[PDB]
Amino acid sequence: LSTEATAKIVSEFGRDANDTGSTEVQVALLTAQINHLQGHFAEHKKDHHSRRGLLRMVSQRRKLLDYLKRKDVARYTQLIERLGLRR
Amino acid sequence: SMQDPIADMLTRIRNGQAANKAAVTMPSSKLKVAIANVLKEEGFIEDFKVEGDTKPELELTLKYFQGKAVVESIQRVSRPGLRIYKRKDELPKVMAGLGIAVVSTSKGVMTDRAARQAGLGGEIICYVA
RNA sequence: AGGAGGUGAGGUUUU
RNA sequence: CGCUUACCACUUUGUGAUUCAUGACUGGGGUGAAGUCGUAACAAGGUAACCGUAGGGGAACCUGCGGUUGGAUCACCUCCU
RNA sequence: CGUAAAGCGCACGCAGGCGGUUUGUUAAGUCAGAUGUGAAAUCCCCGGGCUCAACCUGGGAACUGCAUCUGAUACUGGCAAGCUUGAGUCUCGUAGAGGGGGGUAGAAUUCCAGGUGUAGCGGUGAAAUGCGUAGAGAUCUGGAGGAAUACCGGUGGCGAAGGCGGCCCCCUGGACGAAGACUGACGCUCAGGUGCGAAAGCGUGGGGAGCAAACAGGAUUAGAUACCCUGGUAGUCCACGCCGUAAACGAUGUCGACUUGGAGGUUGUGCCCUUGAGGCGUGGCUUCCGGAGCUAACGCGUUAAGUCGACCGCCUGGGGAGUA
RNA sequence: UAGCUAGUAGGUGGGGUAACGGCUCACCUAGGCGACGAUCCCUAGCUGGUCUGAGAGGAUGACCAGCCACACUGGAACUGA
RNA sequence: GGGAGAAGGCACGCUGAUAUGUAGGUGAGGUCCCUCGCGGAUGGAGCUGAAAUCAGUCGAAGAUACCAGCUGGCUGCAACU
Ligand SMILES: [Mg+2]
Ligand SMILES: [Mg+2]
Ligand SMILES: [Mg+2]
Ligand SMILES: [Mg+2]
Ligand SMILES: [Mg+2]
Ligand SMILES: [Mg+2]
Ligand SMILES: [Mg+2]
Ligand SMILES: [Mg+2]
Ligand SMILES: [Mg+2]
Ligand SMILES: [Mg+2]
Ligand SMILES: [Mg+2]
Ligand SMILES: [Mg+2]
Ligand SMILES: [Mg+2]
Ligand SMILES: [Mg+2]
Ligand SMILES: [Mg+2]
Ligand SMILES: [Mg+2]
Ligand SMILES: [Mg+2]
Ligand SMILES: [Mg+2]
Ligand SMILES: [Mg+2]
Ligand SMILES: [Mg+2]
Ligand SMILES: [Mg+2]
Ligand SMILES: [Mg+2]
Ligand SMILES: [Mg+2]
Ligand SMILES: [Mg+2]
Ligand SMILES: [Mg+2]
Ligand SMILES: [Mg+2]
Ligand SMILES: [Mg+2]
Ligand SMILES: [Mg+2]
Ligand SMILES: [Mg+2]
Ligand SMILES: [Mg+2]
Ligand SMILES: [Mg+2]
Ligand SMILES: [Mg+2]
Ligand SMILES: [Mg+2]
Ligand SMILES: [Mg+2]
Ligand SMILES: [Mg+2]
Ligand SMILES: [Mg+2]
Ligand SMILES: [Mg+2]
Ligand SMILES: [Mg+2]
Ligand SMILES: [Mg+2]
Ligand SMILES: [Mg+2]
Ligand SMILES: [Mg+2]
Ligand SMILES: [Mg+2]
Ligand SMILES: [Mg+2]
Ligand SMILES: [Mg+2]
Ligand SMILES: [Mg+2]
Ligand SMILES: [Mg+2]
Ligand SMILES: [Mg+2]
Ligand SMILES: [Mg+2]
Ligand SMILES: [Mg+2]
Ligand SMILES: [Mg+2]
């Protein structure tokens, strides 16, 4: 992912624009990467070697979302509403 | 992943005894300190200490008598996959009295010989002989 | 002592 | 008391599932007497064996592709260093 | 559960199983006591009576249990507040046949059109079929098309496995290395489930240079539907799907902590006059030999088949059969 | 044996039993059980106990005692505490 | 996709009540504003009108007349229209 894009996401989701390790920041980065690779996997359908990384990112995002939902539901709902997710 | 720090400590002690190591270092714990207290009181180890304030390291000084080791057998009776709980009427006796069965009772950590006198049971952590 | 090139009935059973 | 209604039993019809017994004939397996054909495998078993797969063929089996070593040391000539 | 039978071909992951560290509280599991009950008969202990015994009988213990109450709080678990050592994220770079798509270059085989030129070519243990005076085979030029990229290339590298090699471009995954910053267990495994998955095989539409099952001929042989030779179809290749099988092997499931070593290889980094390829130390992966230890032995041996924890899968005599 | 159940799960209101209860009826909700094995098939009375086994365990429930079902087979109701 | 209208089985008339003709459909007069007319919200007058349940009733027979698939199983051939 682009360094400028990562910096923009960190500034948008974090507090001091330097934590860059919060659950919301990680989920946003994973979602952005998945959405960017959506167009890559819509053409190269025989790229399972890179699709495994996408699946790993999906699993990591799901685990982070479950942890956020278990810890603070208020932040989880706001994050999913902002990112357009459904669960 | 680490799911049994007490068993890790016991295996560290056993490996040190096997390799003739004078000192053993490990992460510290409130239960590890209590177990080392019982071991020091029973004489299976020389001394134990803790160094640090946020990441405490526990150090144990092993004992070697006549060139060989002292702790010949050391097990973990109770494990996370199978918890062992026994009453006072059926407490074990390791080596017919020549060993110790470390027991966590309602008052603290003590051997079976000291728990039977107090008349309370609990969890059987480990066997040492 | 190191590296490189090949190299043997073409087949012929059972007890 | 009688009649009728409601419930239901014996019983009857139709189409199904499951199980048992048997069935012309047929596929495969097992046990038998030193029966017929060949010798595939055990040594390098005389085409190095083996699994997967497809074809072929009286039979063991053969071949094509990939894979495995759970195969033998192979032995003395020439050239360079 | 490496070689006797036993590790899914490999990964993701729900339920489930387990879970780092500190404090406070609850007191469910657990621990102590008490009450009720746990029929009697039967077992056992101490006795008693049938001339002893069998037999009967008195009392007791026991019936490991269950329910309630009174409490204890070391451990697990429920709750709250926390911590960075696990895990994870970001800044800076490194190597890599990592994956997909699109192009390009050369060597070589084959074929075609020609030029020089004649009696053989090829092949085998030896021959033959076969190709050749219709000019083959040899040598030169031009062209056509397919597939794979000689050396470098190395028990070297990457990927979860299967597996990946000319060069260039686009997209993309992963790993590692020194410094820093941040969340504070977010962690491991996984029945079912999902995805990937050597080669061979199937369907659709192409392409087809070489090799080659099937097939034909010539040889060997008592016979040869094989081993050898001459040709050669499907296939091998491409695009989209299907099958999901291998000696899919390290015959060794995944993750974590510890335990003497020696030779290297590869890939980074920190210093010292780098004072020329030097010396020291720190990481990752990987090859070999061996110590304690383990093992029936072979052998494993800091990358364990050693010392331990969590989880999943599998085996219980050989055939029948991984078959009906 | 991977899907079962429509009086089926519940609710409201009558009826009914010595008594609570879909036990039954009228209506309204689409629920209820089930991978911790619902449903279906086969076998089998259960327990105190008995045999073996040092022990955890394995087999079994004849005679003694307690509980349940039945009296040719399939259903029914009266009297009666 | 089918087989399949598989096979096989139950109700069908009339009266009254539910409902002095229900659910539904059509839809006036009279009400508000209104670009103001072949207009819309409100409204139910009137008209039409199934199907369903309960109870009763008549006949041997209620899809009562005409109209209005016989069905299953095995098998050869052709794919089928
Ligand atoms: Mg013979
Ligand atoms: Mg053979
Ligand atoms: Mg042979
Ligand atoms: Mg052979
Ligand atoms: Mg032969
Ligand atoms: Mg062999
Ligand atoms: Mg075929
Ligand atoms: Mg052949
Ligand atoms: Mg392989
Ligand atoms: Mg074997
Ligand atoms: Mg084996
Ligand atoms: Mg494996
Ligand atoms: Mg804990
Ligand atoms: Mg409690
Ligand atoms: Mg108690
Ligand atoms: Mg006497
Ligand atoms: Mg008793
Ligand atoms: Mg706690
Ligand atoms: Mg838990
Ligand atoms: Mg590449
Ligand atoms: Mg990259
Ligand atoms: Mg599975
Ligand atoms: Mg293929
Ligand atoms: Mg094909
Ligand atoms: Mg050939
Ligand atoms: Mg032939
Ligand atoms: Mg297999
Ligand atoms: Mg291998
Ligand atoms: Mg295997
Ligand atoms: Mg996993
Ligand atoms: Mg390990
Ligand atoms: Mg590697
Ligand atoms: Mg070794
Ligand atoms: Mg072993
Ligand atoms: Mg058997
Ligand atoms: Mg089969
Ligand atoms: Mg009802
Ligand atoms: Mg009432
Ligand atoms: Mg009621
Ligand atoms: Mg019976
Ligand atoms: Mg025994
Ligand atoms: Mg029983
Ligand atoms: Mg009788
Ligand atoms: Mg009767
Ligand atoms: Mg009465
Ligand atoms: Mg007709
Ligand atoms: Mg026929
Ligand atoms: Mg005929
Ligand atoms: Mg016709
Ligand atoms: Mg035909």
Domain ranges within chain B, ordered by starting residue: 1-71, 72-129
CATH code of the domain occupying B72-129 = 3.30.1490.10
DSSP symbol at A34 = H
Look up residue A64 and give its amino acid. L
Task: Please check whether residue B77 is in contact with residue B127, taking contact to mean a CB–CB distance below 8 angstroms.
Answer: yes
Closest CA to B92 of B108, B76, B111: B111
SS3 A68: helix
Structural method: cryo-EM
Q: Which of residues 2-41 of A touch strand E (CB under 7 A)?
A: 3, 6, 10, 18-23, 25-26, 29, 33, 36-37, 40
The reported resolution of this PDB entry, expressed in Å, is 3.1
Domain B1-71 part of CATH 3.40.309.10 = no
As ranges, strand E nucleotides with an atom below 7 A of a protein CB are: 11-14, 17-23, 29-33, 71-76, 83-86, 88-92, 98-101, 159-162, 171-174, 181-183, 185-188, 195-197, 240-241, 255-260, 292, 306-311
**Which CA distances in Å does B44 have to A84, B10, B58, B93, B113?**
62, 12, 16, 17, 16
| Exposure string for B20-42, b = 16+ CB within 10 A, e = fewer | eeeebebebbeebebbbebbbee
How many angstroms is C1' of E154 away from CA of A49? 28
**What distance in Å separates the CA atoms of residue B102 and residue B76, rounded to the nearest whole number?**
10
Look up residue A85 and give its amino acid. L
DSSP symbol at A26 = H
Torsion of CA B41, B112, B31, B81, to 10 degrees: 140
